[PDB]
Amino acid sequence: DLPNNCLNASSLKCEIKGISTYNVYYQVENNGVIYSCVSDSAEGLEKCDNSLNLPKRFSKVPVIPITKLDNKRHFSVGTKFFISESLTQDNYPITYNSYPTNGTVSLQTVKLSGDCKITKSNFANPYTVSITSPEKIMGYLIKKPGENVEHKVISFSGSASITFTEEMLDGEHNLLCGDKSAKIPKTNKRVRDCII
Amino acid sequence: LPNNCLNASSLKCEIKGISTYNVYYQVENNGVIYSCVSDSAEGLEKCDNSLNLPKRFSKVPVIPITKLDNKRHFSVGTKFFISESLTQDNYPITYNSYPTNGTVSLQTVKLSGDCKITKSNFANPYTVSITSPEKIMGYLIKKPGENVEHKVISFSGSASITFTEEMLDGEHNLLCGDKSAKIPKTNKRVRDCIIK
Ligand SMILES: *[C@@H]1O[C@H](CO)[C@@H](O[C@@H]2O[C@H](CO)[C@@H](O[C@@H]3O[C@H](CO)[C@@H](O)[C@H](O)[C@@H]3O)[C@H](O)[C@H]2NC(C)=O)[C@H](O)[C@H]1NC(C)=O
Ligand SMILES: *[C@@H]1O[C@H](CO)[C@@H](O[C@@H]2O[C@H](CO)[C@@H](O[C@@H]3O[C@H](CO)[C@@H](O)[C@H](O)[C@@H]3O)[C@H](O)[C@H]2NC(C)=O)[C@H](O)[C@H]1NC(C)=O
Ligand SMILES: *[C@@H]1O[C@H](CO)[C@@H](O[C@@H]2O[C@H](CO)[C@@H](O)[C@H](O)[C@H]2NC(C)=O)[C@H](O)[C@H]1NC(C)=O
Ligand SMILES: *[C@@H]1O[C@H](CO)[C@@H](O[C@@H]2O[C@H](CO)[C@@H](O)[C@H](O)[C@H]2NC(C)=O)[C@H](O)[C@H]1NC(C)=O
Known part of the structure; x- marks a missing residue:
């Protein structure tokens, strides 16, 4: 269990699948096996495919998603990818941040969070x-x-x-x-x- | 109008998913499928694949997990949540009675609120x-x-x-x-x- 192949995207062929306001969803490929991964800084994606619409830096503000549909308009703070469990039993291993696990990637709106x-x-x-x-x-x-x-x-x-x-x-x-x-x-x- | 997603016992309905704290089902009235999520487990007894339906749902303050490191310590089950589709189009859903566009996504959860x-x-x-x-x-x-x-x-x-x-x-x-x-x-x- 060493998902460091996602650390090497500078030289491995990678495709940009989705772009949020606080993280990025891509997938690299080393020896013929795709590795879906999510990152919060986008350091080695310069040479990826669709490496077009991505930013210098995600601002790393702590954000959690929305449960209150009514509170959407009152708490829209943008989009952020999160690891969801696949709708099928699909156990596709994604390595959100530095922690690997399975599930599917799912984009959700988020709200601000913490002790202000x-x-x-x-x-x-x-x-x-x-x-x-x-x-x-x-x-x-x-x-x-x-x-x-x-x-x-x-x-x-x-x-x-x-x-x-x-x-x-x-x-x-x-x-x-x-x-x-x-x-x-x-x-x-x-x-x-x-x-x- | 999320009509007859509360009347689902009067419609041919298909049970798609069941979580710990909510249930997902689609009803069919006149030509188009209505996707709806609820928590009562009422009127869904006559729907298809309604074999493993729980009596009721606990309906407790429950938010999903962000730091995947804390699933093991805070796992409390699975709950259906409304998200945004990876593609551009988003099917209109009526979570509870609240209607909105989006897609469904299953996520494990943590207990929420204040104790x-x-x-x-x-x-x-x-x-x-x-x-x-x-x-x-x-x-x-x-x-x-x-x-x-x-x-x-x-x-x-x-x-x-x-x-x-x-x-x-x-x-x-x-x-x-x-x-x-x-x-x-x-x-x-x-x-x-x-x-003693
Ligand atoms: C979901 O992610 C988990 C996390 O790694 C993957 O679990 C691994 O699944 C294998 C099944 O091939 C299991 O390892 C087994 O361990 C026994 C005990 O020694 C060994 O005899 C078997 O040969 C096998 O190695 C185990 O459940 C788990 N391994 C871990 C956690 O180290 C799982 O593959 C993923 N699901 C997918 C990709 O569908
Ligand atoms: C969700 O999908 C459906 C169908 O694709 C759409 O929902 C409803 O779409 C109407 C049409 O845009 C929205 O507003 C109406 O717009 C017309 C424009 O001329 C105006 O005449 C009406 O007075 C009304 O404002 C309606 O708000 C919207 N409602 C919902 C619950 O979605 C729509 O394409 C998708 N939703 C959104 C927010 O785009
Ligand atoms: C990521 O890229 C680096 C740079 O090539 C790899 O480091 C190489 O490791 C292999 C051994 O597995 C050897 O070719 C050398 O030790 C390293 N390269 C050089 C030029 O010295 C690294 O293995 C790649 N993969 C990961 C997961 O980090
Ligand atoms: C659930 O279905 C019943 C059908 O018996 C609804 O009762 C009437 O439904 C028609 C539409 O089919 C409405 O036009 C009437 O106004 C309803 N009668 C009333 C409200 O007294 C019922 O409204 C439906 N919805 C529920 C119970 O929430």
């Missing part, structure tokens, strides 16, 4: 909100309901300060950090520009 | 109590890799637990939604006294 200490109350600068997380890395995002807004994920760690843009304070906008979620109310237009 | 294990339950030291603020909750003891297809226990409010000689070896592990716990191994010479 969303600091509602902030002493000074009420228009500036702070956000902390004990996790090593953590991701947040500000978006309206839906909008098909992908990316806009920020790799933050520990201390993080957030200010709102002029349009952003439209009440329908929502701040997503970790599991937690809040809604920003529309501030008065004349209270704005009074900052001067 | 608060009374870690130091001095009162009857060998019996401890759990409290869940949610309306329903799931829990089960399980050593890594132990076959657990329906050993779960539907949990609401606050309840207590009494252990077994098997379950008090150092290998068994306590599971309750979002929390994990390990059981210490009592010497078999101390076991014969608690047996």
Whole structure:
């Protein structure tokens, strides 16, 4: 059990099958046997086939999929591949990340996740909100309901300060950090520009 | 309209898949197959291949696994989830009563929600109590890799637990939604006294 053949994609013939917003699904081939694999950094895919639409770096923000269909529009954070069990008994061995196992690859929408200490109350600068997380890395995002807004994920760690843009304070906008979620109310237009 | 996917006893229906916490079936009304997933196991007795249907489903807070490293420690069964098809087209599905497009995908799962294990339950030291603020909750003891297809226990409010000689070896592990716990191994010479 050494799926390191997926580590060598620089020189082995590989085809790009699918591309998500947070991982990549491909399959290499060494001695006449295909090896489906999923990676989170895409280091040796430059010479693969369909090595066309892939990015420099997946931002590595912890994300878990959606169970709440109703919460889709409220928690769309993009697409990420996950190891599912095949619909047939098919036990096809895929090596998600560095861990090998069987199952089938399946693309699912995901949500943000973790322990974002969303600091509602902030002493000074009420228009500036702070956000902390004990996790090593953590991701947040500000978006309206839906909008098909992908990316806009920020790799933050520990201390993080957030200010709102002029349009952003439209009440329908929502701040997503970790599991937690809040809604920003529309501030008065004349209270704005009074900052001067 | 997900009509007569609740009336499936009035239609010719084909049982496609059965998981631990939900069931997948397709009904046929007038020319086109309706794919639907549910949890009641009601009205599906007259469907085809409905031989191994469970009485009811536990319907506990349940999320799938991400880190494949933790399947062995947190395996609690299999649950059907709505995903996105690898190809472009996506058949409309009506999970519960919620209609949407996509494809089905079977995934093993972990218990979800929030539990608060009374870690130091001095009162009857060998019996401890759990409290869940949610309306329903799931829990089960399980050593890594132990076959657990329906050993779960539907949990609401606050309840207590009494252990077994098997379950008090150092290998068994306590599971309750979002929390994990390990059981210490009592010497078999101390076991014969608690047996009284
Ligand atoms: C699914 O993935 C598992 C993970 O490796 C694969 O399991 C392997 O299946 C083989 C069956 O050929 C088993 O190994 C056997 O062990 C016995 C005991 O020594 C030995 O006498 C046999 O000759 C054979 O080697 C075992 O279940 C397992 N091996 C592991 C985990 O090391 C399985 O092949 C995959 N399913 C597929 C590809 O359909
Ligand atoms: C899911 O597949 C079905 C069929 O392929 C589609 O579902 C429904 O499709 C209609 C047509 O696009 C959606 O909206 C309607 O659009 C027409 C455009 O002129 C408009 O006149 C109507 O007032 C209505 O807005 C409808 O929302 C959609 N519903 C669902 C539940 O899917 C559709 O192709 C696929 N779904 C999506 C979201 O694309
Ligand atoms: C991946 O590529 C490297 C580079 O060729 C392989 O390393 C070779 O290993 C074989 C022995 O199995 C020998 O040809 C040499 O020891 C290495 N090559 C050179 C040029 O020294 C490696 O085996 C490949 N496969 C894996 C799984 O890593
Ligand atoms: C399930 O089927 C029954 C059929 O007896 C439905 O009862 C009527 O169904 C027709 C459509 O065939 C509707 O037009 C009527 O309005 C229904 N009668 C009512 C609502 O009193 C029933 O609606 C179906 N759906 C369920 C029970 O959820």
